[PDB]
Each structure stands twice: as C-alpha cells, then as structure tokens.
C-alpha cells in the first residue's frame, strides 16, 4: 500500500557539468598497453547533466519518472546511505514486466515482477525510543505482484541506517544499459571528500551482476529513504527529514571512445572523437601524443535542407469537352466508354463551372485529388432521370443500378451530373433514349448489357413474340420539357480510377513552386535528383534541349521549364576538414582548417582557417598549410597564420 | 494474420489487434466500409487431404 503527499514548497532542479565521468569496460576481455576504440553507449565528456537535491534544510523531495533512454548514468556522492534502490518499467500499472532493484540492510533482492507501483514509493525509517538505532519499518513500495519468471538475490551488503548532515565521504556511480533485452549493471565505489562539482579524476566502472531478463524499458525512477525521529510528528504529510544526499542522472549517447590500458589492465584515460577537434585528432591517430604538423580527420558535407520539384511551368489540359458538350449522348444499356491516356488533366476547371446540380465523389477527398495521380482514368457517360440520381452510389438496390451499371464496394469513382433539359428533351415526346428494366439475374460491376432477348416470366417459351409471360426488357423514357424537377434528363459522367503497376501517365504535375538560388538545395528536373546551387549562367541553350553536360561529362547545366532560364549546377560540399596542432607539451588549443569550403576566422587562399589569427608579419614556418601560407604558435601566445618568409 | 501495414523485421512477433485501414476514412473499429479485421481463423479439418 501507499499514501499520498501534500503540496509544499520544493526547489527547482539544477544543472551541473560532468568531468571525465561515465567510463566503463565495454567488453569482458583483457587488453594490455593498447589503445583501441569501441562503438558503444557512453556518457559524453563535459556534457550537461541533471542534478537532483535531497537535503532537508527547505524540504526538498523530488521523485520524477524520468524516461529510460539507451543507457543511463546514475552517480551519487553517498555519505549516510540515503538512497535504497531503483525501479524500472513502462506504465507501472501491473500490466508490463516491471523491475525492482532494491537494497535492504540484510540482502540484495532483484525481483522482476509486475508490482503495483504507487505514485511515489519510498522507504520509511523510524527511530525507536528504547533502542538507539535506526531501523526500517514503513515498507511501502508496492501493493502486490501478479505473475513473473525471474527473481535473483545478489550478495549480502551491510548498510548504515543513521542519517547525518555532514560532508560526504564516498561516491557511488551506476550505469544501467539495455541492449537486445539484456540488462547491464556497472558500478564502483570511490572515496572522495567533496560536496558538489565532481572532481576531474578518472575511474572506470566494473560490472557486478549480469541480468538476462529479455524485455524493453522506457522509464525509470529512483527511491529514497527518510527518517522519522522524535523531532518530526511522524506523519508523511508535511514533517520529515531526509539527511543530505545528491544523485546525478545522465543519459548515454552512442559515440566512439578511445580507451587507454596500462600493463596492469585497468583503464586510465578515455578520449572522445565527437567532442573536440583536438580529441578527434587523438583518436584518429590512435595515440595520446600529437606532434606538430597537419592532420586530416573527417570530411565536411553541406546537407541541403529543402527540396524543390517543378516539372511544368503550370498545370495544363488536353483537348476535351466532347464527353460533356455534344449534340447527343448514349443510353444506359450501351453507354459511351472513354479512356484518358497520355493527357495532362486539370480538375479545377471542371469544378469552377458553377452549373452542376449534383456532385458525389467518394474514395478520394475532392480538395486533394489534383496532386495525387493514378494510371488510367475511365469516363462513363449516360443519361438518367432526376429521381434515379440517388440510386447511383455504392451499396444501393433498385431497378437501374442492379441491371445496367452496378457500383462495387471499392468504388473510387467520381460522379458529376447537371441539368440539360433544354437540349436533351423536346416537345412532342423525346423517346430516343432506352433503358433496361427486366433481367434474369444480377450482373457484375463495370459490365455492359446489350442483350435484346425477351425476358421470359413463366415456363412456356414464346419464340420471340409479344404474348403471355414474355415481356420485352427494354422500355422507352417519359422525357418532357414541361415536367418538374424530379424527372429531368440528367447527364451523369463517372470518372473512375485504376490501381495497377504502371507509371502515372495521366497526372497533374507539381506545377510552380518557390524558386531558390545561390544556396545548396535539392531539385528534380525530370531526369535527375542533384543537390547543388543554382547560379545565373551566361550561356544560352538551343531551343530544343533540357539538360547540359561538360568536358568531364557531368550534368552541371539545366533549363528551368517555368520561363526558360539557364541555371548552372555546382556541388556545395568540397573537400574535407583539417586540424592544426602546435604539439605536445606546448599548447592545448587547436585550429580547424577547411580544404575547399568558402566561409578568429581568416579567409586563406587554401579555404577557411578558423581559430587562428592572421598576422601581416612574415617569419619562417614549421606547420605547412598550402599556397605559401603556414601556421605556427607564437606570441599571451596563440596560434597565428602568416605568409612564409623565404 | 493475413494483412499488415508494411514489412516487419526478422525475429519479431506482432500481436496487434487493431483494425487495418485500406483507405483514408476511419471506422471507429466497426465492421463498416473500407476497413477489415486483419486476423482470420483457420480452416483445419480432420478429413482434409
């Protein structure tokens, strides 16, 4: 069981800086006097790390449910053994396999079960009156468990339950990792005499117990123990004491680390590759000593941030309208079938007519069907009365849809109809259009029925006469220009789409987009996807070409189809990076040089040199750079760049 | 299971009972239109071939 806390004044969390902390053995092998690099999860050096306080003098008690990333770093400058253990899980509601690594004064229990975790589990220590010793009595960390398979008990560990307010004497660090379901624990106790601002000393971490559970964790939370002395009333609402403690929580990131080993086999120092340019030079050379000279570490690539595509100047349309504006149309038993291929189609003009009575278009959103394209577009045109326009829908039953043109469930078509009584009907009786009323059975969708056979009703054949039990299925209309609104001739066109493996021939392309120049961007001009700048060229193309090559046979010239301007193509990433090092036992700062990248910072002939000031005086040089310019460490004293004196 | 949204990595178990969407219209997990329940029962029979 658990109880709830009351609202009180807390302290906001602080942020401190790590100093060569979070280094552990990445493997269980022995290495002597070697400098090898591994790609695992480590804490970055000089990184921003969180800080949580636990002192009483006020009433600081923070237990946030921090998310468990790919590896965490838990360091504590423990003095009076305040913190007891840690919990892990995803939702903490007895639904997933949670964890409980809790350390009591007698034995260490690691129970991976589905505990009922409350809002703020904690350990309660009560001070006895007759006995002058602190003992743990309030065991409120969970309610009960449901089912589990793993339960491990580690070696016993003695503990002191008395809390004080003095300075810390020991430092404990913990690293928890989860690779492919396997739990990892690394820890080592290191004595120290300090309160905050952790020392710059180096100490590796060795694993103690390896835990093969086989699950994934996304959240974690730490546990603290408070004391119930005679000063406090003894209620866990507003009066309590927690001694003095401070635990640091840091997240591990995947970086390459260069590990140093002595002849005894222990780790003495670690060098990162993505923290400092000087540290990058140390780990690429696989040595801790760097001499004066030039060095190449990696390359500089200018990644584009935007992509622009424009195939046409504007969207266009091909000759059409005969399926809409015509002298006459067909009936429903034999309707006109039209196929659209190798035609660019615009549906905006088909909507801004403001003359259609009805429009139903399912499957695709009508406002966003222009950008998406399909392979083939089928146009089916037929006439119908005003009261049968409601029947044309997927999932309807009647006398016209089930016998002439069935609508299937997966109908992504587009139905357009309008009133054309002034042309499709005439005085005296317009009976030029026919329809089918009688049929033996149902028909498949997208099927045309042109059979004129007389539908037999009874069991007596008639041999094609007009007698008994034999009715002719095709019947005339009742169109008249003097009718109302429910029986007018409506011209229905169905615009269906096909889904099959073929390039989109009929499509409205990406039209006009925002044009950007003089920046390294990505473009797709109908034949290539190249990342580069677009400068204004001075060479005119013949009026029948699109692309342009060079002596080296590279597409470095393209014509924009918007208004026919010629734009050059030039890559934005040139060469790599370089670092200038004065050498060992001389300096610590370094200068970063770019090979062929155009831009304290000095624009040299051989690219950009940063971190080194330029001096007009000329001396003899020792570290070459290129193009008659060197770098050296002179007079405090910094790295200077100058023309080499002959 | 007969249908899935996309490819799955090897040595992975999927126990998702969510109703697959084939189009762009949600169904609120009913037996409606343009959607269907992905898990289907077998057709085992002792008198099979």
């Amino acid at each position: 069981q658990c109880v709830n806390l009351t609202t009180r004044t807390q302290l906001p969390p602080a942020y401190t800086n790590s100093f060569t902390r979070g280094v552990y053995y990445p493997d269980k092998v022995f290495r002597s006097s070697v400098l090898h690099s591994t790609q695992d999860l480590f804490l970055p050096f000089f990184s921003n790390v969180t800080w949580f306080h636990a002192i009483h003098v006020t009433k600081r008690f923070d237990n946030p449910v921090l998310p468990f990333n790919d590896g965490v770093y838990f360091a504590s400058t423990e003095k009076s053994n305040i913190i007891r253990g840690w919990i892990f899980g995803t939702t903490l509601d007895s639904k997933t396999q949670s964890l409980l690594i809790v350390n009591n004064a007698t034995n260490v229990v690691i129970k991976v079960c589905e505990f009922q975790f409350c809002n703020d589990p904690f350990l309660g220590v009560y001070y006895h009156k007759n006995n002058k010793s602190w003992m743990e009595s309030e065991f409120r960390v969970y309610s009960s468990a449901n089912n589990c398979t793993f339960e491990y008990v580690s070696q016993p560990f003695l503990m002191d339950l008395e809390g004080k307010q003095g300075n810390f004497k020991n430092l404990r660090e913990f690293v928890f990792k989860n690779i492919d379901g396997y739990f990892k624990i690394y820890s080592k106790h290191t004595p120290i005499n300090l309160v905050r601002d952790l020392p710059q000393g180096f100490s590796a971490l060795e694993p103690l117990v390896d835990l093969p559970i086989g699950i994934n964790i996304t959240r974690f939370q730490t546990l603290l123990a408070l004391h119930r002395s005679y000063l406090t009333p003894g209620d866990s609402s507003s009066g309590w004491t927690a001694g003095a403690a401070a635990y640091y929580v840091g997240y591990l990131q995947p970086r390459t680390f260069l590990l140093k080993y002595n002849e005894n086999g222990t780790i003495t120092d670690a060098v990162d590759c993505a923290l400092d340019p000087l540290s990058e030079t140390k780990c690429t050379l696989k040595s801790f000593t760097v001499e004066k000279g030039i060095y190449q570490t990696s390359n500089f690539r200018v990644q584009p941030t935007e992509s622009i595509v424009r195939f046409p100047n504007i969207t266009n349309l091909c000759p059409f309208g005969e399926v809409f504006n015509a002298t006459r149309f067909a009936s429903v038993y034999a309707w006109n079938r039209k196929r659209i291929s190798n035609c660019v189609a615009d549906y905006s003009v088909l909507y801004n007519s403001a003359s259609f009575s009805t429009f139903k278009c399912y499957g695709v959103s009508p406002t966003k069907l222009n950008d998406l394209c399909f392979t083939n577009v089928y146009a089916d045109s037929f006439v119908i009365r005003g009261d049968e326009v409601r029947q044309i829908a997927p999932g309807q039953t009647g006398k016209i849809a089930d016998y002439n043109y069935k609508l299937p469930d997966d109908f992504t078509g587009c139905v357009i109809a309008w009133n054309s009584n002034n042309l499709d009907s005439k005085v005296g009786g317009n009976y030029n259009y026919l329809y089918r009323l009688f049929r033996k059975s149902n028909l498949k969708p997208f099927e045309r029925d042109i059979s004129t056979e007389i539908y037999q009703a009874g069991s007596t054949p008639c041999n094609g006469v007009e007698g008994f039990n034999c009715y002719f299925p095709l019947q005339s209309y009742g169109f008249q220009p003097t009718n109302g609104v429910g029986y007018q001739p409506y011209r229905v066109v169905v615009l269906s789409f096909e889904l099959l493996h073929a390039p989109a021939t009929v499509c409205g392309p990406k039209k006009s987009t925002n044009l950007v120049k003089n920046k390294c961007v990505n473009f797709n001009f109908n034949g290539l996807t190249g990342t580069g700048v677009l400068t204004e060229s001075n060479k005119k193309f013949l009026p029948f070409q699109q692309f342009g090559r060079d002596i080296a046979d590279t597409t470095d010239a393209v014509r924009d189809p918007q208004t026919l301007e010629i734009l050059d193509i030039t890559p934005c990433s040139f060469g790599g990076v370089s670092v200038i090092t004065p050498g060992t036992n001389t300096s610590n700062q370094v200068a970063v040089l770019y090979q062929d990248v155009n831009c304290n910072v000095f624009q040299t002939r051989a690219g950009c040199l940063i971190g080194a000031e330029h001096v007009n005086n000329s001396y003899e040089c020792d570290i070459p750079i290129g193009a008659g310019i060197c770098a050296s460490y002179q007079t405090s004293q910094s790295i200077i760049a100058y023309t080499m004196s002959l | 299971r007969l249908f899935r949204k996309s490819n799955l990595k090897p040595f992975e178990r999927d126990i998702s009972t969510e109703i697959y969407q084939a189009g762009s219209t949600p169904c609120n997990g009913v037996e409606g239109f343009n959607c269907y329940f992905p898990l289907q029962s077998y057709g085992f029979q002792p008198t099979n071939g």
Partner: antibody, heavy 120, light 110 residues
Framework: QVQLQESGPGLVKPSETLSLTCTVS??????????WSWIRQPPGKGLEWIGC???????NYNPSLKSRVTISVDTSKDQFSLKLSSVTAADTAVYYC????????????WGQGTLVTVSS | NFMLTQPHSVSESPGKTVTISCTGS????????VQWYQQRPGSAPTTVIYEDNQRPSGVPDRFSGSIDSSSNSASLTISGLKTEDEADYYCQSYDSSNVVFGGGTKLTVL
C-alpha cells in the same frame, strides 16, 4: 498558417449602406484560387449564407438577399469587402467573413464575429 | 426552395449515444455534400465533420455522420457525451449555386 480579421463599424442606421471589410494576413487572396464568402448569424438563430466570391469577378448571392449584396475583392491590399444596401432592423446578425475552399464543401477557417446592431 | 430541416432541441444524458437529423425538403441529401458545424456560444463556428463519412484532424473520433438517401435526412451520430459538446449544430448544403444551412440543434444535458 493564415488568419482573417474583420473591420468596419459595428453600427449602421436603417436604410443606409453597410461597409464591412475582412482582411487576410499570412496568405494570398489570388493564389490557389481560394474562394471567399460572407456568413451572418442572428443571436439565437441559425447561420445564414449571404454570398460567395472568387478572386475574379465571379459571384453568387442568396435569392432572399439578391440585388442587395455588393462584394468586391482588391488584390493589392489583400482583402475583400461586402456592401449591403437597404439595411433594416431585422438584419441584426453576427457577421463572419468565411474562409472557404470547396464551394460545395466547408468553411475550414472562421474569422471572429463582429457584432452588427442597427443603430437607432 | 430547398431547405434543411433540423430538430431544435436534443437532450440526452452524458455517456450515451445520440442521433441528429438534417432533412432536405425538395433536393435529395445524396445530391450534394453535407457539412456539420459545432459552434461555441459567443465564438466562431468550427467544422466538426465533412464529406458525410470521415472526420477532420483534431476532433475526437466519436463524431460520426451517416446518409440514408431513402428518407432524405442527413444523420449525425454522436456517442459518449461530455461537457464540451454543449453547443449548436448546423448542417450545410449547396442546392444549386446557393448555400443553404440548417435550423440548428441545441445539444443539452437534459
């Protein structure tokens, strides 16, 4: 994104001319052929459609409000205005300039409603 | 002359399901798209559903619309009533170049 702000006086005398202007910031009136419309709503009553306009001269009006609605679009100031003639005391309604794309569809963005009361 | 007939007052307890109708007089509901609008009192209206079967991004999935063209009544089925649903409901149509709105439904607890 984009937003629409209405302006003009909140009062009008009977048998006079109403002048309500709705301005657009964060987008272009002519771009995308985005239609434009006006909707009023009396207090305690349902929404009433007044008329719709295109960035060109195309327009349409409610037959109950026909021959009384004059709406014009100026692209240089990126706004559209509506003029109402022969206003009466029954025209007290909350006017919304209506941002809408599909003429048979929806008013996806609604401007804030200016209170219009016939001034006596 | 085409209008949308909508019930004035609809009252059910929270947690249940309701049905709001929108009946067309002359034109069929299947002829044109119907858009429903949920408007706070003293605030701009907001489209709660459109295209008669699918939902805008941002509203809960409880707002469902259905069309039965036989009775010419546009239906909006709303389930699991809460406090924030207490507003007006208007249905829209188009007829022929003349947008026609609905009467208005007052969704109340009782």
């Amino acid at each position: 994104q984009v937003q629409l702000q209405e302006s003009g006086p909140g009062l009008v005398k009977p048998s006079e001319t109403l002048s309500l202007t709705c301005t657009v910031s964060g987008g272009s009136v002519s771009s995308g052929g985005y239609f434009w419309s006006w909707i009023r709503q009396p207090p305690g009553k349902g929404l009433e459609w007044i008329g719709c306009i295109y960035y060109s001269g195309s327009t349409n009006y409610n037959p109950s409000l026909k021959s009384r609605v004059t709406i014009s679009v100026d692209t240089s100031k990126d706004q559209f205005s509506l003029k109402l003639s022969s206003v009466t005391a029954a025209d007290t309604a909350v006017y919304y300039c209506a941002r809408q794309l599909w003429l048979r569809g929806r008013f996806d963005y609604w401007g804030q409603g200016t209170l219009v009361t016939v001034s006596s | 002359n085409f209008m949308l007939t909508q019930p004035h007052s609809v009252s059910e307890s929270p947690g249940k399901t309701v049905t709001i109708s929108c009946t067309g007089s002359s034109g069929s509901i299947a002829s044109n798209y119907v858009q429903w609008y949920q408007q706070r009192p003293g605030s701009a209206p907001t489209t709660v559903i459109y295209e008669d079967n699918q939902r805008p991004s941002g509203v809960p999935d409880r707002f469902s619309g259905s069309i039965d063209s036989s009775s010419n009544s546009a239906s909006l089925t709303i389930s699991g009533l809460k406090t924030e649903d207490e507003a007006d409901y208007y249905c829209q149509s188009y007829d022929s170049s003349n947008v026609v709105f609905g009467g208005g439904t007052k969704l109340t607890v009782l």
